[PDB]
Each structure stands twice: as structure tokens, then as C-alpha cells.
Curated annotation (Swiss-Prot):
Allosterically activated by inositol hexakisphosphate (Ins6P). The keyword Protein biosynthesis does not apply. It is linked to Basal ganglia calcification, idiopathic, 6: A form of basal ganglia calcification, an autosomal dominant condition characterized by symmetric calcification in the basal ganglia and other brain regions. Affected individuals can either be asymptomatic or show a wide spectrum of neuropsychiatric symptoms, including parkinsonism, dystonia, tremor, ataxia, dementia, psychosis, seizures, and chronic headache. Serum levels of calcium, phosphate, alkaline phosphatase and parathyroid hormone are normal. It comes from Homo sapiens (Human). This is Solute carrier family 53 member 1.
Length: 596
């Protein structure tokens, strides 16, 4: 509960291999002390010899660590000096060409903010490495009852060209002078507000009020869920179709679950070290922690349960029950498109810019955030089918003349209410067109043309499912050829998406696995059982995702298809939750998508 965990939490994740390696030294010291011979059953000269050999070993490995740190610091400082040179040349060129321009100035501001962050990170590297050297030499002096630790400290560590190099501080002062004089016309307060680096990474605890709001929204949600179960068992009339209600309130629940699991994903990414900040292109001084995602999910789930309870209980008699789902989803939309500057404005508007860039995306160049949201839409595809069902049900099947709305006595439609497939492929189409744009951009046909057929398989599966459904509904003869076609494309799609998940989305099953059998060379998440369980769960849940797509866009299994979809949709959201971890891990470790 000291500098070991302080070091693990304050390490820059991409430079983890070039730090002090505190725990190795600690284990070396403890093992040396443990296997020390006796003091009177053995010879004292042998004890002196053993302790001298251990001292030699310790100082050899300490010299190796110091050399590593010096090499890394020299490389990084040279890089920063070159970056400052080119940035000053760019600013000089832009400002003398000044006598568009706004975009140029914004990009210069952003480049100077990222140059400052690298300097701050290198400074923190220096500080942590020096403090780790002092603490471990102190532990050596304490464990062995000697003074060679502080001797080696004063002799070697405080001469090293990484503790005596006051060149990063000059660079920081120079950068501040540049940003203040040439980019802000004085006004150092505004420059430093843009340049100052808050304690980042796993090194910040969320405000107590955010955690209290998480806990408050979670308790209300829990009690309202208990109340929903009790009101479903004891208050729903036993002569009405509750299935329209289930279909309407299914998409909201999937959204709440997705936000909860995204919060858990953010916690795992922040803890294991894989920084979604650099991959998503978020600014490192302001991100959403897992607490904010948990709070958003809890609020939206509170609203969901309140609307469902109002549907079950019908509190007031003037307003019919179909207003409650409308109200819930209208508030959900008004939360997202809130034009004021309140309630997570930066996050919501980043998300809206992303949604405009994924729903119109043969024209925008694909980043990682444009790809992850279009991949997450594949799991949240039942939300679009729920929206289409809500529109169809309110336009064609709701009476509007009786307060008892969503729950009708007995009546149906042709299927359930063509355009129930198109709205299943929509996200597959987005990802297909994005992969095509990426191929056109990079001209590298392997990762992009492959992974475009990955979604053409979904296209073909939905098409042939719908064809066989309509042909078995009207009792035709060429129905069997279509059933075999659908089964072959189901197998093809399941294996295609399964191989891509494990091979070049997660990186697993590589030739250089080493001792991590069937895994990557370097794993980030602690337990090895996490990866094997994830493999098994993805194998199970990937096959029971194409089945749901086939059964949602069809008319077969009318009674059991809805139970199937209701059970399998949160399972698919959980599958995407599991997929996020290892996709993000294999993007930090190896560009898997060639972004960056």
C-alpha cells in the first residue's frame, strides 16, 4: 500500500517496460533474505560470502536498470527537441503566411497542447524513476543492515543524465512562452488553462458526489426492478398481449445494459492500462470515467423503470398508457440533443458528431471512434428494430380511442407490427461502406476488403432468411433450396465473424504465443483464465447472434421467436462488452486496424 502501487498506478502505460521494475528488486531482496544460511550452524565466512554475492548481483541489475532509463530518456528528449523544432517552423510559416486560418490556429493550439503533454509525461517519468531508486536502495539498506545502498545512490543515480538534465524544464518554459506570446496575445491565464495537465490515468479518484449519484441511481433502480417484478406477478391483467409492451421496452433496456457494460469496459481499460483516450482521440485532460457512464446508465434506467411501472399501474386515468413509452424515448432523445451546455455537453456532442460521421460514412475518413461505434451498432441492432416496431405499432395498430393502449385484447398483423430486414442490415451496411472507404484510403486490400465480406455475409443471411420465410409462408416449392442457402450462409457468417473476432480483432492465436498458450505474446489483463473464458463465451454467443438476426427478420417461430430475441439480445450486448476489452487491448499492443 505504498510506492509499489503508487508506481503501478502512476506509470505511463505505453512506457511500462522502461520503468524501474520495483517489484522485481523487492522479490530479489526478500528471496535473498529468505534463503540466507544459518549464523551458527554454518560458517560466518560463508554468510559473508553469500551476502557479498547478493550485493554484487543487486548492484549489477541496478546498473542495468539505470542504463535502460538513461537510454530511454535520451531518446525521448531528442524526440521532443526535434518536435519543438518542427513545431516552431510550422508556427513561423503559418504566421508569416498570415501576412481555414481558424482551422490552422486550432490545429496549432492542439499540437502545442500535445507537445506539452509529452514533456509533462517525460518529467513524471524522471520523477518516478528517481523516487523508485531511492525507495529501493533504502529497502536494500534496511534489509541488509548496510550503507552501500545510499552510497550507490549518491555515487551513480545523482550523476546520471536523466536526473541532472534540466532541459525538459527549459523546453516547458519555452513552450509556455510561445503559446502565450504568439497564440494568445498575452493572456497567460488562458494559455496555461489550455496547457495544464491534470493528474491523469488511474491517478485520479472520481468526485465523491459522482460516486454518491452512482450509488443513489443504482439503489433506486434495484428497488424499482423488484417492484416491477412484483407488479408483473400481481397486477397485469391475464387477458391482454403484453408482447407489444415487451417489444417497445426492450430497446431501452438494451441501451441501459450497453451503457453499464461500457462503464465496466472503461474501468477495465483504465485499470489494465490500455488507454482508450489515445485510441479514441479524446483529450487527456478531460475524459469520462466509469463513474460517469454508470451514472448516465443509472439515470436512464430509472426513467425506464418509471415508465414501465406507469404502464403496469396506470397511475392517472386521464392520460392513456401509450404516452409513457413515448415520453421515455422523447426524453432520451432530448437528453442527447440537449442544445444547452448542461448534463454532459461535451460527451453528448462528441457522440452526436460521431453519429453524424458514422451514419453518413462513405464521405468521412474512418478513425477508431467511427469504427467502434459502427461495430457497437451491430450489437444494438435490436434497438433499431424496436424503433421501427414502435413507429409501425403507433401508426398502424394503436387504437388511440381507448386508454388501454399498448395492451390490446387480441389482434395481429401480417407478421409482426420487408423494412424489418433493411433495418437489421443498416449497421452492417454502415460498417461495409466504412471498410470500403478504408480500402480506398489506404489501398491495402487485406484488412479492409476482407472485413467487408464479413458484413456481406450478414447481408446474404438476412436476405435468404427473409426469402425463405416469405416462400414458406405462401407455401411455395422452391422453399427448400432457400432453407439450405440460409443454413449455409448462417454457418459462413458465424465462422467468418468468429475467426475475425479471435484472429485479428483480439490478436489471439498467434505463432509467438510463448508460455501464454493460445494467447498473444504479451497479455495486459492479469488472469489467463479471462482470455480462455472469453474465447469460449464468444464461440457460444457468436453463434447465438446470427440465429437471432435470422429469427428477428422472418415470420417463422411466431411464438418462440420473441422469447428467443428477448433472451438473446442482452446476451449479444454482453458479447460486445467482452469483445471491447480485447479489441482495445490489441490496438494498444499492436495497431490491429492500422489507425495511427
Amino acid at each position: 500500500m505504498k510506492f509499489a502501487e503508487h508506481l503501478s498506478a502512476h506509470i505511463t502505460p505505453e512506457w511500462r517496460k522502461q520503468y524501474i521494475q520495483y517489484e522485481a528488486f523487492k522479490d530479489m531482496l526478500y528471496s535473498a533474505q529468505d534463503q540466507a544460511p544459518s549464523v551458527e550452524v554454518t560458517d560466518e565466512d560463508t554468510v559473508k560470502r553469500y551476502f557479498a554475492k547478493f550485493e554484487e548481483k543487486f548492484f549489477q541489475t541496478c546498473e542495468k536498470e539505470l542504463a535502460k532509463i538513461n537510454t530511454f530518456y535520451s531518446e525521448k528528449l531528442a524526440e521532443a527537441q526535434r518536435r519543438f523544432a518542427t513545431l516552431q517552423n510550422e508556427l513561423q510559416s503559418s504566421l508569416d503566411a498570415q501576412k481555414v486560418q481558424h482551422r490552422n490556429i486550432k490545429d496549432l493550439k492542439l499540437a502545442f497542447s500535445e507537445f506539452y503533454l509529452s514533456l509533462i509525461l517525460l518529467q513524471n517519468y524522471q520523477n518516478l524513476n528517481f523516487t523508485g531508486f531511492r525507495k529501493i536502495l533504502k529497502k536494500h539498506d534496511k534489509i541488509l543492515e548496510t550503507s552501500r545502498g545510499a552510497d550507490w545512490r549518491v555515487a551513480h543515480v545523482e550523476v546520471a543524465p536523466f536526473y541532472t538534465c534540466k532541459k525538459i524544464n527549459q523546453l516547458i518554459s519555452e513552450t509556455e512562452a510561445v503559446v502565450t506570446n504568439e497564440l494568445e496575445d498575452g493572456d497567460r491565464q488562458k494559455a496555461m488553462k489550455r496547457l495544464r495537465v491534470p493528474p491523469l490515468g488511474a491517478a485520479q479518484p472520481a468526485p465523491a458526489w459522482t460516486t454518491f449519484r452512482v450509488g443513489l441511481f443504482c439503489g433506486i433502480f434495484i428497488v424499482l426492478n423488484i417492484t416491477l417484478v412484483l407488479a408483473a406477478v400481481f397486477k397485469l391483467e391475464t387477458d391482454r398481449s403484453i408482447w407489444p409492451l415487451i417489444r417497445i421496452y426492450r430497446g431501452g433496456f438494451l441501451l441501459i445494459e450497453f451503457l453499464f457494460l461500457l462503464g465496466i469496459n472503461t474501468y477495465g481499460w483504465r485499470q489494465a492500462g490500455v488507454n482508450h483516450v489515445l485510441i479514441f482521440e479524446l483529450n487527456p485532460r478531460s475524459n469520462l470515467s466509469h463513474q460517469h457512464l454508470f451514472e448516465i446508465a443509472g439515470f436512464l434506467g430509472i426513467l425506464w423503470c418509471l415508465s414501465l411501472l406507469a404502464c403496469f399501474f396506470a397511475p392517472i386515468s386521464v392520460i392513456p398508457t401509450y404516452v409513457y413509452p413515448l415520453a421515455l424515448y422523447g426524453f432520451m432523445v432530448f437528453f442527447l440533443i440537449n442544445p444547452t451546455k448542461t448534463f454532459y455537453y461535451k460527451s453528448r456532442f462528441w457522440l452526436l458528431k460521431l453519429l453524424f460521421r458514422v451514419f453518413t460514412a462513405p464521405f468521412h475518413k474512418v478513425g477508431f471512434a467511427d469504427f467502434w461505434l459502427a461495430d457497437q451498432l451491430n450489437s444494438l441492432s435490436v434497438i433499431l428494430m424496436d424503433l421501427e416496431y414502435m413507429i409501425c405499432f403507433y401508426s398502424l395498430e394503436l387504437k388511440w380511442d381507448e386508454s388501454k393502449g399498448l395492451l390490446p385484447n387480441n389482434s395481429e398483423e401480417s407478421g409482426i407490427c420487408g423494412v424489418r430486414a433493411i433495418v437489421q442490415c443498416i449497421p452492417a451496411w454502415l460498417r461495409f461502406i466504412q471498410c470500403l472507404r478504408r480500402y480506398r484510403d489506404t489501398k491495402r486490400a487485406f484488412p479492409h476488403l476482407v472485413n467487408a465480406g464479413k458484413y456481406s455475409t450478414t447481408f446474404f443471411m438476412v436476405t435468404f432468411a427473409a426469402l425463405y420465410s416469405t416462400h414458406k409462408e405462401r407455401g411455395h416449392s422452391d422453399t427448400m433450396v432457400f432453407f439450405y442457402l440460409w443454413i449455409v450462409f448462417y454457418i459462413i457468417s458465424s465462422c467468418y465473424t468468429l475467426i475475425w473476432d479471435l484472429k485479428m480483432d483480439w490478436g489471439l492465436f498467434d505463432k509467438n504465443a510463448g508460455e501464454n498458450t493460445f494467447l498473444r505474446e504479451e497479455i495486459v489483463y492479469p488472469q489467463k483464465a479471462y482470455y480462455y473464458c472469453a474465447i469460449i463465451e464468444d464461440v457460444i454467443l457468436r453463434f447465438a447472434w446470427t440465429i437471432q438476426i435470422s429469427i428477428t427478420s422472418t415470420t417463422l417461430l411466431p411464438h418462440s421467436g420473441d422469447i428467443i430475441a428477448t433472451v438473446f439480445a442482452p446476451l449479444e450486448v454482453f458479447r460486445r462488452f467482452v469483445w471491447n476489452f480485447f479489441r482495445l487491448e490489441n490496438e494498444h499492443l499492436n495497431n490491429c486496424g492500422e489507425f495511427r
